[PDB]
Amino acid sequence: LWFRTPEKIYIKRGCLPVALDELKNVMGKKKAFIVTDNFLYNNGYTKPITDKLDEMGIVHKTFFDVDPSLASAKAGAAEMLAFQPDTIIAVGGGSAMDAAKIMWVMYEHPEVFPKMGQKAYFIAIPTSAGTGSEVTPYELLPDMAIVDADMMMNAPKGLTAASGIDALTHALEAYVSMLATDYTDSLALRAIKMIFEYLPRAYENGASDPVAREKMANAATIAGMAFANAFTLERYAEIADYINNEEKVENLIKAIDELKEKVGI
Amino acid sequence: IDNVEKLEKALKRLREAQSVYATYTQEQVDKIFFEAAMAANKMRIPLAKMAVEETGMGVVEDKVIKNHYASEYIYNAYKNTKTCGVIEEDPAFGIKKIAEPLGVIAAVIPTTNPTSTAIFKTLIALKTRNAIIISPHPRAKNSTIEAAKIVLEAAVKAGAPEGIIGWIDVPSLELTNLVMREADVILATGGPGLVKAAYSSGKPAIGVGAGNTPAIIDDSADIVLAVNSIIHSKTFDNGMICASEQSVIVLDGVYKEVKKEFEKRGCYFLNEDETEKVRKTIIINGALNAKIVGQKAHTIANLAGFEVPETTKILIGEVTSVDISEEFAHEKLCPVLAMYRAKDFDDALDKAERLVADGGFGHTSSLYIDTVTQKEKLQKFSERMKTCRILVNTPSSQGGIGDLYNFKLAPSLTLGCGSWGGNSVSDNVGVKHLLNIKTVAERRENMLWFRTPEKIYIKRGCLPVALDELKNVMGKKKAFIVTDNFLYNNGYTKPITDKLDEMGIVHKTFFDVSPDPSLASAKAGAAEMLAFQPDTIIAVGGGSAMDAAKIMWVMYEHPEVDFMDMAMRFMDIRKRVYTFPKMGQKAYFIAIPTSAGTGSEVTPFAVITDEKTGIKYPLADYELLPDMAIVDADMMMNAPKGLTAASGIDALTHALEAYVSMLATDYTDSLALRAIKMIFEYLPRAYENGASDPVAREKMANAATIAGMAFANAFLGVCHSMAHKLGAFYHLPHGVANALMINEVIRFNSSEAPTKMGTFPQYDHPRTLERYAEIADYIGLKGKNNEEKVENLIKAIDELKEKVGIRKTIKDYDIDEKEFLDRLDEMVEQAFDDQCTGTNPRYPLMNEIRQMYLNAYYG
Ligand SMILES: [Fe+3]
Secondary structure, three states: OOOOOOOOOEEEEOOOOHHHHHHHHHHOEEEEEEOOOOHHHHHHHHHHHHHHHOOOEEEEEEEEEOOOOOHHHHHHHHHHHHOOOEEEEOOOOOHHHHHHHHHHHHOOOOOOOOOOOOEEEEEOOOOOOOOOOHHHOOOOOEEEEOOOHHHHOOOOHHHHHHHHHHHHHHHHHHHHOOOOOOHHHHHHHHHHHHHHHHHHHHHHHHHHOOHHHHHHHHHHHHHHHHHHHEEEEEEEEHHHHHHHOOOOHHHHHHHHHOOOHHHOO | OOHHHHHHHHHHHHHHHHHOOOOOOHHHHHHHHHHHHHHHHHHHHHHHHHHHHHOOOOOOHHHHHHHHHHHHHHHHOOOOOOOOOHHHHHHHHEEEEEEEOOOOOEEEOOOOOOOHHHHHHHHHHHOOOOOEEEOOOOOOHHHHHHHHHHHHHHHHHHOOOOOOOEEEEEEEEHHHHHHHHOOOEEEEOOOOOHHHHHHHHOOOEOOOOOOEEEEOOOOOHHHHHHHHHHHHHHHHHHHHOOOOOEEEEEEEEHHHHHHHHHHHHHHEOOOOHHHHHHHHHEEEEOEEEOOOOOOOHHHHHHHHHHOOOOOEEEEEEEEEOOOOHHHHHHOOOOOOOEEEOHHHHHHHHHHHHHHHHHHEEEEEEEEEEOOOOOOOOOHHHHHHOOOEEEOOOHHHHHHHHHOOOOOOOOOOOOOOOOHHHHHOOOOOOOOOOHOOEEOOOOOOOOOOOOOOOEEHHHHOHHHHHHHHHHHHHHHOOEEEEEHHHHHHHOOHHHHHHHHHOOOOEEEEEOOOOOOEEHHHHHHHHHHHHHOOOOEEEEEOOOOOHHHHHHHHHHHOOOOOOOOHHHOOOOOOHHHHOOOOOOOOOOOEEEEEOOOOOOOOOHOOOEEEEEEOOOEEEEEOHHOOOOOEEEEOHHHHOOOOOOHHHHHHHHHHHHHHHHHHHOOOOHHHHHHHHHHHHHHHHHHHHHHHHHOOHHHHHHHHHHHHHHHHHHHOOOOOHHHHHHHHHHHHHHHOHHHHHOOHHHHHHHHHOOOOOOOOOOOOOOOOOOOOHHHHHHHHHHHOOOOOOOOOOHHHHHHHHHHHHHHOOOOOOOOOHOOOOOOHHHHHHHHHHHHHHOOOHHOOOOOOOOHHHHHHHHHHOOO
């Protein structure tokens, strides 16, 4: 077995500026390539990142044209090759991160796993709390991950519910998986317990309950780690007890149905 | 207002008016500013005539220009500047500036600029929402008063409070002294005698200095431009304006052309007798003559006693000395000018500094030079003059008040001279000097992290695979194996050297590491590494070998590093004074544990014994994380009984203190809980059988690794701060020392009313009892009231200690009572001054640490 995670994972509210100032100017990077989508770029969710990269001396280029398509990935790779960046920042979560990873692969290896750590330094910043794509791939694994609730305060209700259910599903299959070990078991159990407590609060109040949003972000990250490191009746019984080993499955499925009802699925 | 009582009443009414005016919005202030600027601009011509008639000096046209400047440019500069409420707002942080007003201002007006300065000060006071009191010079009083009226009425026609500008009709020394002592802030002007009283009154003040300004002309200069600029600036308002050139230093190379250009355009050069006459005329009885300021060159010459053509503009007298005794080296607000002869640029710089230090210290200075190829001379000039306003190719009178010839310079009168002149501004006085910026702060939290070594391989028999990976993807060629003598003598490194000797890797081993390693062994290992120059480092020992290998790695990649500098205590890991050097260029670090409960294969700590005094110094930084962690049960199935028990209890203490620590997040919480459960579930079986229970041995190693990650990301507490010193003083094993103190630290931390807390932003209130309750619930214990659960946890820990053959107290390990008592006083101080102590939730004191030690010893 193994255990692979990104080099640095930074988690707290308001950690985006400090995670950039204290490292990016320290490493001496001079060029940045932000990759986002139309919606986030238009609403101005990339403003703090460009504002931070403006205070210190880095020139930045934004690519906001991206389910992703391979044609968009090739266009982004061509744009990267023309711009020749050094740091790649992926913002948006989900499709945006996969697209950015593919662009990174094609930009650092135009011949097309090969070793891609020479031309670019990859940073992932999620704006959704369901995918956990910043910690999952093993040569696609990002070099750094920044998790803060400020980027995820104003998510819509349907997206919030879908993201929560996706994180729950990831945690459940990470715990049940045949390759699961103690590390993934502990992470998945923690993620499930945090999901069964704060998802209704995040779906009801939304931005009015920042604690629930931050807990959902952390649970999404833990579930992503568990899924990345881990791709039966006793397992489900232990999960239910943590939250005659036959009725426990029924109670767990009833609780899952109740949670789905609470978020309007 | 010519007596005290009326002045006090005026202050009272001005304070009442300011209290109302301080709450106006942006639009009202904008309208008032616009109306006042309109009135002041429209009344530019009569004011200049009145000022010239009353003061008896100056040129009416230049005063018109000055009034028009003080209205139009002042309005244009701060036309759309925000001075009302929130200015800067950073949502990520919690900072917010409000920019409140200042209060009532006591403004002093000189006699050289009666109306323009009054207009400027009144406008900047109105824009900033402050009241103002004008104290006019006795020579120009009426004119200044009129200026204020021209604004005041306009202000109250836009919505300003009635008594928002006030003035003293008849000024006197006692009245001025009293009015300075009452206003919150003083805005002084008029040079020495008044600025000293402003700065010695008990209230904050903003004064201005004045004096000589030197103009330098060198070989590579535009002669026509320099001469004409000097003439323009000197003749502007007959030199009665401040910052006008008082002396010009011309180099030897272009003296003739400069002199010819000066005499071509209306300048009169003085011979010896006329120079002496002007000397006697200018300074009388060691003071400036009051009948010379603002007068024409012809008038000055007639006062001296000789006649000059009616078209003469400047009187120029060539002199040689720059000392105080030279009357031509002093300030003179008149068209009289002095010219110096210089040999090279350095002589010009020396004369300029000698002339600016004695006179206008901190005020303007000017240079004329070709700033295309003579870049070095410009930098030399810049890095030499104690001058707040250095001008290049610019007339000084119009350059000091800079919006005409240069931009991005604040347009204003009241030229600040900085600390050199006894002032506190060192800049052009704008609106930002009349504001009280107040900041709003919101509670944030420190950024946290999750840092682990990459490529952590977890499987029995996986060492062959992970060591074969070394050649395919990485392809290293040299290997250095750091172990201890015990495992080397018993052949515990045989598989590794067998795997390396299979293929093309040259390997060397170092086995001279004793338990509790010393720094001399670190030097020996670093020297051997330097001699061999390896590409990989492998540590195949449990507790001491990893620390030794890490310190040899540090001393090998950076031989110039110092241990005492590198082993300092800090408060924040990311704010430490000493920054660890990067370690990724020479060697590759691999850790292969053989004792379960150390966790050093995944953590940034390393403890080293000094051997000079005998103190175990722990040092921590994330640059020490190995690049490869290989854990395999095969090399851990032959541990003794006592060693296994010590390792298990040390791992349990690691997990408990990681869970309880202030730096605790969900990651370390889950890891610590899993490690805690798996240690209780499997430790006795591993201790009893050992070789016959492979499952228990694998589970113990897995739990040890989980706990290692847990406290690698969340630092430990005071239990280790005590156990380190206890095991260093009496040669006790680390696990045993941890076992004897955990059940007392648990009681120490679980207090709803602690004497002190751990001063961490996310640690809001004492919550340790609840955390211990969660631990008890997860481990499978029963209780109620959140109190019996902690007691049952303590009982379970005691039973676990009893099961693994660990005694009950310190005294059971043959520790002399007198020796213990004689060194407890010195050991407590060392226990308190430890790196881990700063992370404990309760932050123990000295007496409480001593009491814990006594309770541990006496049971
Ligand atoms: Fe320890």
